[PDB]
Ligand binder design. Structure first.
Ligand SMILES: *[C@@H]1O[C@H](CO)[C@@H](O[C@@H]2O[C@H](CO)[C@@H](O)[C@H](O)[C@H]2NC(C)=O)[C@H](O)[C@H]1NC(C)=O
Lengths: 247, 217, 214, 217
């Protein structure tokens, strides 16, 4: 994973996102959704999804939330106050903690001013405390600003490392982007049915065809402009649409 | 280097209040983790509050709410405005500059009695006697009793004698008032010869009395 | 769940020796805490850093031994001037838990007390009450007994004692016992006696006066 | 039981202002009918304002508007923030706990002069003389004159003599400043014998002067 003071930032983009494999994986110790409850994720579409990744203590997962304070949310990683995404977290004691102490996971513990939301700060200047110019030298009136979790496998819970991923769905002003999944049923034939073919809503009997579209045409129309054939998206076969009987 | 001094302690009753000023003698209280540490007498320590270089509070468990911390960087002062003291905090207060650990933390007191005594001493001189005399030395002292406002001091000869001068811990009677006695030994050849005057000062009140101790009549 | 740290307090030793103090940790803590020196009537001073990296401005007598849990401090080659308590803490976490504190005595040998009894001052008998003070001066074993007797009747339940901190120079204790009576009850008896028992005395010492005898 | 004390009086000019704090020494100002009673000197009383246990105001007739009452239960304090004093209220203010009638109401003063004198005394000693002497006793005193800030005090020998000491009501001259004289009789055998020093204290200012009175030269 990535440190807590220099988190990563992956910009998920146009694709088919299935937040159900996430939501039901039962391996996550924390799955909170803020802008939007979790089950309705696989039914919405945004412009961009960002995913931020890092590693913290066990009991600092409560500062990854909109409107908190503490050494993590103050100056390591700040979430805006109208967040939209979801926060996921799971314990990772066996991967990140090693006997003798894993001193490779640092965090920032001194900064001049709290972060703006989604702002990032990887500098390593000596936190000049005393009016006396530090001059880049340690000692008194000058602290190094980074400390390290010394993780060890025999730590009580709440001191073992947790890995965190923060998904943030954003909606600029583009034309579209990544969308959830497309729940579909099965296609029946020879029965007056109520059908929807990726947008085409109609009613009628469906029947095997013997016409041949061109391999970019979806549905066919009659003279007087009524839909009378479709192509099944999944199997790509042409089916005629006749009305069911009236008289 | 840094010599934090604090001021503001005294005596008050419940529902009272009090501002404490951790005067940052020393530098840069604008950018340091500061905190209040508390201990009742005869007890271990306890943690109260904390300010971040950037502003956050996180108060303790029992003093959740009803208790406020702040700083002032231009004055180099930490401010602790409390109120509604359950009088169950009667304690000795410390403010310490957390520097990755702690250290650098002055001292300062407080008492929150539900009474309004603050009377002062009742001083008697305990004369040097042959029952206290043994060979080369003999002991004499001053008994200062029946006072509520705990911090009281008795010196010997305006602070002159430091040999044998021993003030014993004050005792709390059933009446609710404190009492103590401070005694010093001095060569038995010198029973009445030199000056032995106990200087009693009561700081919550304004009592100042000098009492001479002489051998029994 | 908060951590509850523990300590085997009330140490006693002599100078130039080795002594060792442990600190329990009743939860899985990592290895970041700290020890403090609390001289009586003063401010603490931290000695051991967040493990064993002893903070500067300290001598070479402390040796903090760290672990996952069960941390342990050790003083080797003592020096008469460490009369105070030693606490544990636990940096990192905001609300931190503190220890229980270990006072440490300085074994001496066998130094009996100077005893002295003081009758009540004439000023106090005007007020209507009689304090009878008995002083025990300098003494190692603090396990001293003060028995008041009034006309040879052992007095129970009208006395109070207090004791000083172990002296930084000669490592002794001093004790003051006060017997409190009314003027009326004071004037009903003659001999006031204070009988002190102590290891440096082969048999107890009684200092006594006779009310009303210049 | 209940011993209401108040604080906040002083001197100011029109359009001024002032907060008065009826400090509820005593209990439960959260649930009691409280009120302000006013009287000009030499006059009968007058009623000002009132708070309900639940919050309501109902101010008086002439002080309708421009005048605000409130409480604080956690501090046990009543707050009276006034402003724009027509200076025609120069009065002696009382705050009383209405308990189905009234009673239990401390005291506290105020003056709203349109001037800024606050100068202080002009003290002279009026010597004991045979024209004041008659038989066994003779009278001596101190004349303290020309001051605006009405509350002024003169004691005799730091508060020692209470026999014959009589301070007469201050008089208001045409100049606009007050003046008074306090006199005490003392046996004529004791004209100069003992100490007779008048201690003049002016509280709005900070004047403190001791003047000795001796027989005429
Ligand atoms: C959509 O997916 C289905 C399977 O989920 C594909 O169906 C396969 O079609 C081929 C024909 O070329 C068969 O040989 C496979 O056995 C089918 N798989 C199953 C599971 O039935 C279908 O082809 C996919 N859509 C497109 C356009 O390829």
């Amino acid at each position: 994973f990535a440190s807590v003071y220099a988190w990563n930032r992956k910009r998920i983009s146009n694709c088919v996102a299935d937040y159900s494999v996430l939501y039901n994986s039962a391996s996550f110790s924390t799955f909170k959704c803020y802008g939007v409850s979790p089950t309705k994720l696989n039914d919405l579409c945004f412009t961009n999804v960002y995913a931020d990744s890092f590693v913290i203590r066990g009991d600092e997962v409560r500062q990854i939330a909109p409107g908190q304070t503490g050494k993590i949310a103050d100056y390591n990683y700040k979430l805006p106050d109208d967040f939209t995404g979801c926060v996921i977290a799971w314990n990772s004691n066996n991967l990140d903690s090693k006997v003798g102490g894993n001193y490779n996971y640092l965090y920032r513990l001194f900064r001049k001013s709290n972060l703006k939301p989604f702002e990032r700060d990887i500098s390593t200047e000596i936190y000049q405390a005393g009016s006396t110019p530090c001059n880049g030298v340690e000692g008194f009136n000058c602290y190094f600003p980074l400390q390290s979790y010394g993780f060890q496998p025999t730590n009580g819970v709440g001191y073992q490392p947790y890995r965190v991923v923060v998904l943030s769905f954003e909606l600029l002003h583009a034309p579209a982007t990544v969308c959830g999944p497309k729940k579909s049923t099965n296609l029946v034939k020879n029965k007056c049915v109520n059908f929807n073919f990726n947008g085409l809503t109609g009613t009628g009997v469906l029947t095997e065809s013997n016409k041949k579209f061109l391999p970019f045409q979806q549905f066919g129309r009659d003279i007087a402009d009524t839909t009378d054939a479709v192509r099944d998206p999944q199997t790509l076969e042409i089916l005629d649409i006749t009305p069911c009987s009236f008289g | 280097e840094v010599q934090l001094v604090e001021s503001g302690g005294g005596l008050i009753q419940p529902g009272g209040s009090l501002r404490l000023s951790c005067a940052a003698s020393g530098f840069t209280v604008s950018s340091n983790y500061m905190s209040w540490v508390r201990q009742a007498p005869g007890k271990g320590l306890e943690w109260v509050s904390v300010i971040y270089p950037g502003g956050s509070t996180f108060y303790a468990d029992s003093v959740k709410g009803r208790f406020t911390i702040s700083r002032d960087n231009s004055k180099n002062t930490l401010y602790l405005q409390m109120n509604s003291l359950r009088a169950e905090d009667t304690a000795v207060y410390y403010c310490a500059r957390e520097t990755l650990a702690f250290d650098y933390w002055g001292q300062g007191t407080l008492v929150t009695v539900s009474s309004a005594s603050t009377k002062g001493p009742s001083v008697f001189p305990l004369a040097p006697s042959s029952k206290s005399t043994s060979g080369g030395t003999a002991a004499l002292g001053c008994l200062v009793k029946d006072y509520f406002p705990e911090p009281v001091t008795v010196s010997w000869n305006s602070g002159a004698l430091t040999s044998g001068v021993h003030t014993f811990p004050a005792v709390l009677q059933s009446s609710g008032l404190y009492s103590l006695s401070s005694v010093v030994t001095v060569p038995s050849s010198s029973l009445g010869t030199q000056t032995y005057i106990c200087n009693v000062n009561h700081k919550p009140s304004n009592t100042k009395v000098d009492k001479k101790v002489e051998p029994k009549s | 769940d908060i951590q509850l740290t523990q300590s085997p307090s009330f140490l006693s030793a002599s100078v130039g020796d080795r002594v060792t103090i442990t600190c329990r940790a009743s939860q899985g803590i990592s290895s970041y805490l700290a020890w403090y020196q609390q001289k009586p009537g003063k401010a603490p001073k931290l000695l051991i850093y967040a493990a064993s990296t002893l903070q500067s401005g300290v001598p070479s007598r402390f040796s903090g031994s760290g672990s996952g849990t069960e941390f342990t401090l050790t003083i080797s080659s003592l020096q008469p001037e460490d009369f105070a308590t030693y606490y544990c803490q636990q940096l990192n976490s905001y609300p931190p838990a503190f220890g229980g504190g270990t006072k440490v005595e300085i074994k001496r040998t066998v130094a009996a007390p100077s005893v002295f009894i003081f009758p009540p001052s004439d000023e106090q008998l005007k007020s209507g009450t009689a304090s009878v003070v008995c002083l025990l001066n300098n003494f190692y074993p603090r396990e001293a007994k003060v028995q008041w007797k009034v006309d040879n009747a052992l007095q129970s339940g009208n006395s109070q004692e207090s004791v000083t901190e172990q002296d930084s120079k000669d490592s002794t204790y001093s004790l003051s016992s006060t017997l409190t009576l009314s003027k009326a009850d004071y004037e009903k008896h003659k001999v006031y006696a204070c009988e002190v028992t102590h290891q440096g005395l082969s048999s107890p010492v009684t200092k006594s006066f006779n009310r009303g005898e210049c």
